[PDB]
């Protein structure tokens, strides 16, 4: 019942823009912070961005700073990642991950208990 | 940035073996370490949080230990469904960082 | 509107145990002190685990049977288990009572420690309202609020502006 | 012009475990658990024990000929006996209520 | 030729520390037997010197 | 340069547990609060001695042998000692864990108590830097520093000089 | 004349554990913080009752006799009671020692908590003398003193009058 | 040995004034706060006034505020209740009650351990 | 003002019965409750203070329990001299207030 | 290995000056405070002066105030006592004593664990 | 100035005796008392610090007790080498002060 669904990935030329969507259901989406984690083909996991539950605070990895913008829609229970000035090194499978809560508080810095199947972004 | 060094990069073992994977951090991350299991084509699965706590629905043969800088993930008795790649993730501070990864493969 | 820890807790603080609430021109909201929450979560988890994991016990046995003409030995076994039952019960009760009082004091100290850090940063650029809130004597934009929560607020940067606002109050 | 309030630090590598934290470095500590023994059999509050050489307690009490005779009035804080004494009950037969007798003769004035 | 307040069959425990993990059986004025490997009380301060 | 207790301890403080560091025209150096060190040394020595000396025990015996057809009585003796082993081990572990946490808190309170005494003496003749140090708003010669450490600093003596230095900062 | 909690307790405070002493034009006297005394009396009464009432014990028996040829079983019973005697004695001693130290700390925290509440109300309309007393920088009539003790003193009401008295001191 | 004695009650017309006296003996009267408690015929107990040990602080029920004044005499070990503008609803048996001490401190807010026989005030 | 609601207004019982009287407060009064026994023509007598503590010289058949809002006075085994009216009194804050009263009477 | 050595004592006329030397070895002399203790012939022990480890703080008995000056040399591991305006009542055997450390801190106020043989000063 | 009053000024005893020497202070010195043994022509030797702690290399027949104002040095069983003069020294505050002294001599 609790699972995320990514969408919006595809083949894109260098320098263009994409917006990813992460549709959440089964849990109080507006209580959790959210993260985007990408994985290049054959490589490891890289965290790119994160946003607080109310969207007031946003954190970005240096590799996507100034080009990626995270955001969320409370009424649609959806998380977004706007990706600008795309580069071939941005090519990866992009996951939206939910940080685990503990002691009943939704801490954004924790392990990631829920992931979606991921969406593929190919820049070439 | 806190960097996690995972050892070994890969290891080969048979079913019923004991497998040890270590994760080393550049600075104290207390207990905010996570272990993930990833089969090809599938998203990572949370196995261990708090560097030792077992995630609900995960067999008791997976165990984690460590605090501060050195952490260890142990599979006491391997199973056929345990052949995958394993990642350690820190949760001490932003940016969130992962280990290089460890593939457990058949010999 | 909106008061601090002196008058109780916040239902709006959901992403941490301890945090802050702010109001300026650009808006308002809650924000948890993530690091202080981290340090306290480790302490509470360690305390519970120590109380649980330290119970390293010898192998428990149920062989407590003696023959029909040894009822006195059976009574000795019965009162031996009664003695340990009284010892463990009394120690367990007062352990929980003592630790629970200390755990609540632990949270109070952590909350007070955030209050002191903000108080010593603002110095007299703000007025302590006595309810856990501070009345900033200058405009504090969203960057200024983040600097206070990160421990990087500069006293001498807003010092002149705060001084003029203070003498108006006088 | 500055004045600061501080506390003491040193190079001690000692660590202690608290109820909230593990392996906390401390400037000094004190162990309350004795982990060492001198490996010797000693007097107990200045009272010598009774050494049975190579005789069991029943053999020494009954006067096995290969055992040293008690020639003079003596005292002991405890009785030391070999794990597998050379000289025991030389003439086969049970020694009754040995455990109860030990309670009487282990510590004598 | 030694004197102790507590004696075990593997050696004497000449100690007034309240606990010992040496041997379950002993004679005399003895510490309480425990299975703890270490029992170290902190007396000084947190050793976290400034860099 | 040179910060206070907020950022950690001092390797240079060797003649006491708690102390001060100063800097003025005449020089600099470390100095231990001898009396506060005295009072804490007695408390720590008493705590360790109480944990040690209160272990007033009955005479320990090794007579735990029963005859060949009384193995059940031997098992009862075996589990009696197992019960006390579990009781003493668990209580000893949590005693050390609890006291160690309180001992570290005891040192923190003593350090904070020196910081409050200096803070209430200087009042607003100094600026709290937030790192355990104070920025004296007047010239404080070696006699002045000793008066602060002895609790005999006079607020009204340097009050006018501090006020002029403060309005420059404003 | 008349100092505060820093220099010790008051023989004149008879109607409560914690309280205040005042002096203004209309007179002087002692007055207990009744509510703080109430809250602490409940805590101390609960602590003593918990230490007493939690001792819920099994039925105690004196049947500890074995026959003439069972002295080893009698010795086992003798050392079983010796073990519980050592366990209860040691735990009882350190329970009282630990709780007594915490009880005294409990009173100190309550006294300090009254001192902080008054300090944050007066702000800079008064000067902290460092002995547990405050030097009001304005006339504080009997209504004003009651407002401080009730937590309803207004900072901005006496702010202008206090400011003029402060610059005279400067 | 420890007991109080009320006096001064009687039949009084509406709007007139009475002063009650409570003579204390056997205990350190000047260490305790004191209270007056009245009971209308056939009705329950109603607390009307209280005074601290030194007389500096005084507490009144709303029903007698502005008309009743409590007071005490240290040298005479006597407690007083001055009753002005008496009304028929003031008719009651008036007791002086001593609050109980606890932990050695004479707290004024506690149970009442000592009462006198009471004095009767009838307003009609 | 804290109001104390006493139940029942009255009850009839015989000697040796168990009698329960409750006192309900509008707000938390912690432990500052008192119970009084009053015979006609006589001043009230203090039975229970602290909501459970027995007053010196009062038989042990009188007991009190409760904390915060709900309190109970229990007479385990009634006696001839226990037929009277009983009041609960709060001591949390001024004004001091009493319950409506409870008369224990013979059947 | 750990011991002090006093020197510089001798016969001296009233009003003259002497300087005593205390040569330390075997221990970290610059970590300890140091004291001078004198003993008149047939009389008890009298503490006269003390100095902190870094020499910044100095303590004197009233009997030698303004006439005696303590000091130390870190590079020579030597303690000094300059004695001016000597009086017949200053005649004593002069010891330099090391205060004991405890809990690893070199507290100057403690018992004296190390003494030298002493040097004799006779004023006549 | 804290003054230490030592009693007795002298005492005579034989070998194997139990000797008690007391030291009285004008004010609380907590535990900061020291005991010294001095043979003629030799510097004092530290026996007891902390008013009870035995100095390393000192026989266990020397013991000290006391706290605050009254302190006692006890020699359980005298030896030939224990005939000397004994001093109590306070370490509470400057100026450091000593007791008048106690000579233990043969009868
Ligand atoms: C008869 O009954 C007794 C009592 O139940 C059993 O004895 C217990 O046996 C278990 C397992 O053999 C013991 O547990 C082990 O303790 C080892 C030592 O632990 C100390 O040291 C480590 C650091 O090395 C500390 O972390 C620890 O807290 C202790 O301070 C551990 O090294 C063992 O670790 C094992 O488990 C972990 C996961 O839990 C793995 O990661 C490790 O790799 C390793 O596999 C283990 O914890 C226990 O202490 C014994 N207790 C007693 C009282 O004897 C007997 O086994 C039993 N007999 C039979 C035949 O069943
Ligand atoms: C059989 O086994 C038992 C248990 O081991 C022995 O009983 C012990 O005997 C010793 C010595 O007889 C007891 O120790 C003594 O306790 C006395 C009372 O102590 C309390 O009161 C004093 C104040 O008066 C407190 O200071 C103290 O903390 C206690 O609260 C002390 O007065 C004794 O002091 C002696 O030693 C000190 C130095 O340590 C000297 O300065 C004194 O002058 C004096 O000589 C002493 O401490 C002990 O309490 C007994 N324990 C039990 C459980 O009985 C039996 O002796 C033993 N039988 C044989 C034959 O050996
Ligand atoms: C053989 O020996 C044993 C041990 O002495 C006796 O067992 C005890 O029996 C008594 C009475 O039967 C027990 O006490 C009762 O406990 C009940 C449960 O208490 C728990 O729950 C309540 C809440 O319901 C808590 O308040 C309490 O703290 C406990 O957590 C209570 O409900 C009983 O209350 C009774 O007394 C109060 C006044 O004290 C009245 O107000 C009540 O109305 C009620 O009458 C009571 O406290 C006790 O717990 C038993 N202990 C054990 C170890 O068994 C046997 O009775 C004895 N056999 C014989 C024949 O005498
Ligand atoms: C109670 O509140 C719930 C949300 O709060 C969350 O869950 C609790 C258990 C704590 O973990 C808290 O820290 C969390 O923020 C709701 O899901 C639930 O419906 C609420 N229940 C009612 C009856 O309103
Ligand atoms: C001691 O003081 C008494 C009065 O004090 C009261 O009683 C003590 C026990 C505490 O409860 C305290 O809080 C009270 O205020 C006098 O009655 C007594 O006479 C005095 N004793 C002496 C010897 O002076
Ligand atoms: C460590 O430091 C030592 C000096 O410090 C002193 O000794 C320690 C044990 C504590 O008592 C401390 O308070 C003291 O100030 C040196 O002697 C030693 O050589 C040093 N060791 C190393 C390896 O550098
Ligand atoms: C906040 O204030 C700083 C200080 O001048 C300024 O640099 C920054 O631009 C301000 N931000 C906003 C959003 O006004
Ligand atoms: C927050 O504080 C850290 C030090 O802990 C500092 O490195 C960082 O630059 C600060 N950032 C902000 C935005 O204040
Ligand atoms: C320090 O200041 C005081 C205050 O006037 C003065 O009396 C004293 O001489 C000064 N000391 C030095 C060394 O300047
Ligand atoms: C230090 O304080 C004490 C009081 O504790 C006082 O008697 C003494 O004169 C003061 N000395 C200095 C130099 O401040
Ligand atoms: C106390 O001051 C207030 C403030 O103006 C005033 O209203 C009141 O009358 C004063 N009371 C007395 C007794 O002077
Ligand atoms: C005292 O404070 C209470 C709030 O706790 C308030 O209702 C009351 O009016 C205040 N009274 C006075 C005289 O300050």
How far is the C-alpha of A107 from the C-alpha of A101, rounded, in Å?
A: 6
Choose among D11, D92, D84, D21: nearest CA to D54: D84
Contact criterion met (CB below 8 Å) for A32 and A105 = no
| DSSP3 helix / strand / coil % (chain B, rounded to 5) | 5, 45, 50
Contact criterion met (CB below 8 Å) for E31 and G86 = no
Contact between chains at C17 and A52 (C-beta distance less than 8 A): no
Contact criterion met (CB below 8 Å) for K10 and K85 = no
CA A76-A80-A83 angle, 5° bins: 155
CB atoms within 10 A of CB J49: 26
How far is the C-alpha of G110 from the C-alpha of G38, rounded, in Å?
A: 11
| Residues of chain D contacting C43 with CB distance shorter than 8 Å | 20-21
Query: Distance from the CA of F146 to the center of ligand 9, in angstroms?
Result: 12
**Cα–Cα distance list, K65 to D46, K52, K60 (Å):** 24, 5, 13
Q: Is the CB of residue G61 below 6 angstroms from any atom belonging to ligand 3?
A: no
Q: Given the CA of residue G152, which atom of ligand 12 is nearest to it? A: 14
How far is the C-alpha of B9 from the C-alpha of B102, rounded, in Å?
A: 5
Contact between chains at E40 and D27 (C-beta distance less than 8 A): no
Question: What are residue A119's DSSP bridge partners?
Answer: A94
As given in the structure block, the two tokens for residue J84 are 């001016």
For residue G100, give every residue at least 6 positions away whose Cβ sits within 8 Å of its Cβ, in sequence order, or none: none
How far is the C-alpha of C104 from the C-alpha of I100, rounded, in Å?
A: 39
Choose among I71, I86, I74, I91: nearest CA to I36: I86
Residue nearest atom 5 of ligand 6, based on CA coordinates: D10
Contact criterion met (CB below 8 Å) for J48 and K98 = no
Q: What is the DSSP string of chain G?
A: ----GGG---SS--S-SSEEEEEETTEEEEEE-HHHHHHHHHHHHHHHHHHHHT---PPP-------TT-HHHHHHHHHHHHHHHHHHHHHHHHHHHHHHHHHHHHHHHHHHHHHHHHHHHHTTSEEE-SSS-EEESS---HHHHHHHHHT---TTTSHHHHHHHHHHH-
Q: How many CB pairs under 8 A join E and F?
A: 88
Q: Is the CB of residue F152 below 6 angstroms from any atom belonging to ligand 10?
A: yes
Contact criterion met (CB below 8 Å) for J97 and J38 = no
Q: How was it solved?
A: X-ray
Q: In chain I, where are the structural domains located?
A: 4-106
Outline where DSSP puts E strands in B1-107: 4-7, 10-12, 19-25, 33-38, 45-49, 53-54, 62-67, 70-75, 85-90, 102-105
For residue I83, give every residue at least 6 positions away whose Cβ sits within 8 Å of its Cβ, in sequence order, or none: I104, I105, I106
| DSSP3 helix / strand / coil % (chain I, rounded to 5) | 5, 45, 50
B81 DSSP 8-state letter? G
Choose among D27, G124, G59: nearest CA to E49: D27
How far is the C-alpha of H91 from the C-alpha of C50, rounded, in Å?
A: 67
How far is the C-alpha of I55 from the C-alpha of H104, rounded, in Å?
A: 16
Peptide linkage before I95 cis (omega within 30 of 0) = yes
Residue nearest atom 3 of ligand 10, based on CA coordinates: F150
φ, ψ for residue C67, nearest 5 deg: -70, 180
Contact criterion met (CB below 8 Å) for D48 and E24 = no
- Taking the Cβ of residue G71 and every Cβ of chain D, the question of whether any pair is shorter than 8 Å is answered with yes
Q: How many domains in chain G?
A: 1
Contact criterion met (CB below 8 Å) for F123 and G128 = yes
φ, ψ for residue C27, nearest 5 deg: 145, -155
Choose among H28, H12, H41, H31: nearest CA to H118: H41
In a mutational test of the F interface, the residue from G6, G85, G170 whose CB has the highest number of chain F CBs within 10 Å is: G170
Q: Counting every residue, how long is chain G?
A: 170
> Collapsing DSSP states into helix, strand and coil, what is residue K79?
coil
Choose among K28, K9, K94: nearest CA to K66: K28
Place of tokens 């606890």: H102
For residue F112, give every residue at least 6 positions away whose Cβ sits within 8 Å of its Cβ, in sequence order, or none: none
For residue D19, give every residue at least 6 positions away whose Cβ sits within 8 Å of its Cβ, in sequence order, or none: C46, C47, C50, F94, F97, F98, F100, F101
Find, in chain F, the residue whose alpha carbon is nearest to that of E42: F100
**Cα–Cα distance list, D98 to D80, E26, J54, K39 (Å):** 15, 20, 71, 58
Q: What is the DSSP string of D42-95?
A: -EETTB--EE-TTB-HHHHHHT-TTS----S---BS-EE--SS-SB--SS----
Peptide linkage before C138 cis (omega within 30 of 0) = no
Query: Distance from the CA of F141 to the center of ligand 9, in angstroms?
Result: 7
Contact between chains at J45 and K42 (C-beta distance less than 8 A): no
Q: CB burial class (10 A; 0-12, 13-18, 19+) of residue C120?
A: middle
How far is the C-alpha of H53 from the C-alpha of H108, rounded, in Å?
A: 8
Q: In chain A, where are the structural domains located?
A: 3-123
| Residues of chain F contacting J52 with CB distance shorter than 8 Å | 15, 31
- J44, J115, J118 ranked by CB distance to K98: nearest: J44
Contact criterion met (CB below 8 Å) for G151 and G20 = no
Query: Distance from the CA of A104 to the center of ligand 6, in angstroms?
Result: 46
Find, in chain J, the residue whose alpha carbon is nearest to that of D7: J105
Contact criterion met (CB below 8 Å) for B88 and B72 = no
- Taking the Cβ of residue F1 and every Cβ of chain D, the question of whether any pair is shorter than 8 Å is answered with no
Residue nearest atom 8 of ligand 8, based on CA coordinates: C150
Find, in chain J, the residue whose alpha carbon is nearest to that of E42: J103
Q: Given the CA of residue G143, which atom of ligand 11 is nearest to it? A: 1
As given in the structure block, the two tokens for residue A81 are 């990642």
How far is the C-alpha of G43 from the C-alpha of G66, rounded, in Å?
A: 48
Q: Is the CB of residue F61 below 6 angstroms from any atom belonging to ligand 2?
A: no
Query: Distance from the CA of D23 to the center of ligand 8, in angstroms?
Result: 28
Residue nearest atom 23 of ligand 6, based on CA coordinates: D11
Choose among A81, A88, A6: nearest CA to A40: A88
Query: Distance from the CA of G140 to the center of ligand 11, in angstroms?
Result: 9
For residue C69, give every residue at least 6 positions away whose Cβ sits within 8 Å of its Cβ, in sequence order, or none: none
| Residues of chain F contacting E33 with CB distance shorter than 8 Å | 81, 84-85, 88
Contact between chains at I96 and H110 (C-beta distance less than 8 A): no
The crossing angle, in degrees rounded to 10, of helices F34-53 and F71-122 is: 170
Indicate the class that CATH gives domain B4-106: mainly beta
**K positions 29-58 inside 8 Å of F (CB):** 30-32, 50
Peptide linkage before F37 cis (omega within 30 of 0) = no
Contact criterion met (CB below 8 Å) for G166 and G137 = yes
In a mutational test of the B interface, the residue from A5, A57, A111, A114 whose CB has the highest number of chain B CBs within 10 Å is: A111
| Residues of chain K contacting F42 with CB distance shorter than 8 Å | 30-31
Question: What are residue B53's DSSP bridge partners?
Answer: B49
How far is the C-alpha of D101 from the C-alpha of D98, rounded, in Å?
A: 5
Peptide linkage before K95 cis (omega within 30 of 0) = yes
Outline where DSSP puts E strands in H1-124: 3-7, 11-12, 18-25, 34-39, 45-51, 58-60, 68-73, 78-83, 92-99, 112-115, 119-123
Contact between chains at F14 and J102 (C-beta distance less than 8 A): no
How far is the C-alpha of K96 from the C-alpha of J109, rounded, in Å?
A: 8
Find, in chain H, the residue whose alpha carbon is nearest to that of I42: H117
Q: Homologous superfamily of H3-123 in CATH?
A: Immunoglobulins (2.60.40.10)
Choose among I27, D6, C15, D39: nearest CA to F31: D6
H or E element that contains K28: none
Choose among H105, F103, C133: nearest CA to G107: H105
Query: Distance from the CA of H1 to the center of ligand 5, in angstroms?
Result: 19
How far is the C-alpha of B76 from the C-alpha of B63, rounded, in Å?
A: 8
Place of tokens 């010195």: K29
As given in the structure block, the two tokens for residue H53 are 């040990």
Contact criterion met (CB below 8 Å) for H37 and H44 = no
Q: How far is the alpha carbon of C148 from chain B, nearest alpha carbon, in Å? A: 19
φ, ψ for residue B50, nearest 5 deg: 65, 10
How far is the C-alpha of C106 from the C-alpha of C96, rounded, in Å?
A: 15
H56 DSSP 8-state letter? S
How far is the C-alpha of A103 from the C-alpha of B46, rounded, in Å?
A: 18
Q: Given the CA of residue C57, which atom of ligand 1 is nearest to it? A: 53
Q: Counting every residue, how long is chain C?
A: 170
**Cα–Cα distance list, K15 to K22, K105, K107 (Å):** 20, 10, 10
How far is the C-alpha of I66 from the C-alpha of B34, rounded, in Å?
A: 48
The rounded Cα E5 to chain-centroid distance in angstroms is 13
Chains that touch F (3 or more CB pairs under 8 A): C, D, E, G, J, K
For residue G38, give every residue at least 6 positions away whose Cβ sits within 8 Å of its Cβ, in sequence order, or none: H107, H109, I30, I32, I92
The rounded Cα I102 to chain-centroid distance in angstroms is 8
Contact residues of G toward C, CB < 8 A: 50-51, 54-59, 61, 63-66, 73, 76-77, 80, 84, 87-88, 91, 95, 117, 120-121, 123, 155-156, 159-160, 163
J113 DSSP 8-state letter? E
Contact between chains at D24 and E17 (C-beta distance less than 8 A): no
Choose among A37, A29, A41, A46: nearest CA to A101: A29
**Cα–Cα distance list, H82 to F60, G125, H9, H18, H70 (Å):** 75, 40, 11, 6, 6
Contact criterion met (CB below 8 Å) for A20 and A83 = yes
| Residues of chain B contacting A44 with CB distance shorter than 8 Å | 87, 98-101
For residue C164, give every residue at least 6 positions away whose Cβ sits within 8 Å of its Cβ, in sequence order, or none: none
Query: Distance from the CA of F97 to the center of ligand 10, in angstroms?
Result: 40
Q: How many CB pairs under 8 A join A and B?
A: 63
- Resolution (Å) of this entry: 2.6
How far is the C-alpha of I25 from the C-alpha of I32, rounded, in Å?
A: 11
H or E element that contains F43: helix F34-53
Q: Is the CB of residue G24 below 6 angstroms from any atom belonging to ligand 11?
A: no
**Cα–Cα distance list, A75 to A3, A32, D94, F108, K26 (Å):** 17, 14, 92, 48, 79
CATH number at residue F160: 3.90.20.10
Question: What are residue J4's DSSP bridge partners?
Answer: J24
H or E element that contains B43: none
> Collapsing DSSP states into helix, strand and coil, what is residue A100?
coil
Find, in chain D, the residue whose alpha carbon is nearest to that of G75: D103
Contact criterion met (CB below 8 Å) for I51 and I64 = yes
How far is the C-alpha of I28 from the C-alpha of I92, rounded, in Å?
A: 8
> Collapsing DSSP states into helix, strand and coil, what is residue H11?
strand
The rounded Cα H53 to chain-centroid distance in angstroms is 13
Choose among K105, K93, K107: nearest CA to K2: K93
Contact between chains at D16 and E47 (C-beta distance less than 8 A): no
β-pairing, A18-25 vs A78-83, is: antiparallel
How far is the C-alpha of B41 from the C-alpha of C78, rounded, in Å?
A: 62
């Amino acid at each position: 019942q609790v699972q995320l669904v990514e969408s919006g990935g595809g083949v894109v030329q260098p320098g263009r823009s994409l917006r990813l969507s992460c549709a959440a259901s089964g849990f109080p989406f507006s209580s959790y912070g959210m993260h985007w984690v990408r994985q290049a083909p054959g490589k490891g996991l890289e965290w790119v961005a994160g946003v607080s539950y109310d969207g007031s605070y946003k954190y970005y990895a240096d590799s996507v700073k100034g080009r990626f913008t995270i955001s969320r829609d409370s009424s649609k229970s959806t998380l977004y990642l706007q990706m600008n000035s795309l580069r071939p090194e941005d090519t990866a499978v992009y996951y939206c991950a939910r940080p685990s809560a503990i002691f009943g508080i939704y801490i954004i810095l924790n392990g990631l208990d829920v992931w979606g199947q991921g969406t593929t972004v190919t820049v070439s | 940035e806190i960097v996690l060094t995972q050892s070994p990069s890969s290891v080969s073992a048979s079913v019923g073996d004991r497998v040890t994977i270590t994760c080393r951090a550049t600075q104290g991350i207390s207990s905010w370490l996570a272990w993930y299991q990833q089969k090809p084509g599938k998203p990572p699965k949370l196995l261990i949080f708090g560097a030792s706590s077992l995630q609900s629905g995960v067999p008791s043969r997976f165990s984690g230990s460590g605090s501060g800088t050195d952490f260890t993930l142990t599979i006491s008795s391997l199973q056929p469904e345990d052949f995958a790649t394993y990642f350690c993730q820190q949760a001490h501070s932003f940016p969130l960082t992962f280990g290089g990864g460890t593939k457990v493969e058949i010999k | 509107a909106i008061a601090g820890f002196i008058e109780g807790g916040w239902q709006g603080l959901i992403d941490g145990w301890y945090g802050y609430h702010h109001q300026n021109s650009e808006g308002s909201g809650y924000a948890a002190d993530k690091e202080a929450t981290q340090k306290a979560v480790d302490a509470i988890t360690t305390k519970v685990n120590n109380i649980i994991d330290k119970m390293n016990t010898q192998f428990e046995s149920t062989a407590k049977e003696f023959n029909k003409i040894e009822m006195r030995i059976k009574h000795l076994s019965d009162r031996v288990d009664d003695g340990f039952l009284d010892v463990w019960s009394y120690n367990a009760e007062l352990l929980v009572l003592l630790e629970n009082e200390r755990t609540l004091d632990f949270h109070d100290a952590n909350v007070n420690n955030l209050y002191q850090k903000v108080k010593v940063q603002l110095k007299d650029n703000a007025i302590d309202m006595g309810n856990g809130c501070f009345k900033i004597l200058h405009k504090c934009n969203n960057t200024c609020m983040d600097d206070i929560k990160n421990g990087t607020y500069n006293y001498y940067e807003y010092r002149k502006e705060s001084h003029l606002e203070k003498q108006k109050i006088d | 012009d500055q004045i600061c309030i501080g506390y003491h630090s040193n190079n001690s590598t000692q660590t202690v475990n608290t109820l909230l934290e593990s392996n906390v470095p401390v400037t000094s500590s004190h162990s309350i658990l004795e982990k060492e023994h001198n490996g010797l059999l000693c007097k107990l509050k200045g009272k010598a024990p009774l050494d049975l050489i190579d005789c069991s307690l029943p053999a020494w009490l009954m006067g096995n000929p290969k055992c040293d005779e008690l020639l003079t009035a003596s005292e002991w804080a405890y009785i030391k006996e070999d794990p597998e004494p050379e000289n025991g009950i030389c003439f086969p037969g049970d020694f009754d209520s040995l455990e109860d007798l030990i309670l009487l003769v282990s510590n004598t004035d | 030729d030694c004197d102790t307040i507590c004696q075990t069959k593997i050696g004497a425990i000449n100690s007034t520390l309240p606990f010992q993990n040496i041997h379950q059986n002993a004679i005399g004025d003895c510490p309480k037997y425990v299975k703890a490997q270490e029992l170290v009380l902190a007396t000084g301060l947190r050793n976290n010197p400034i860099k």
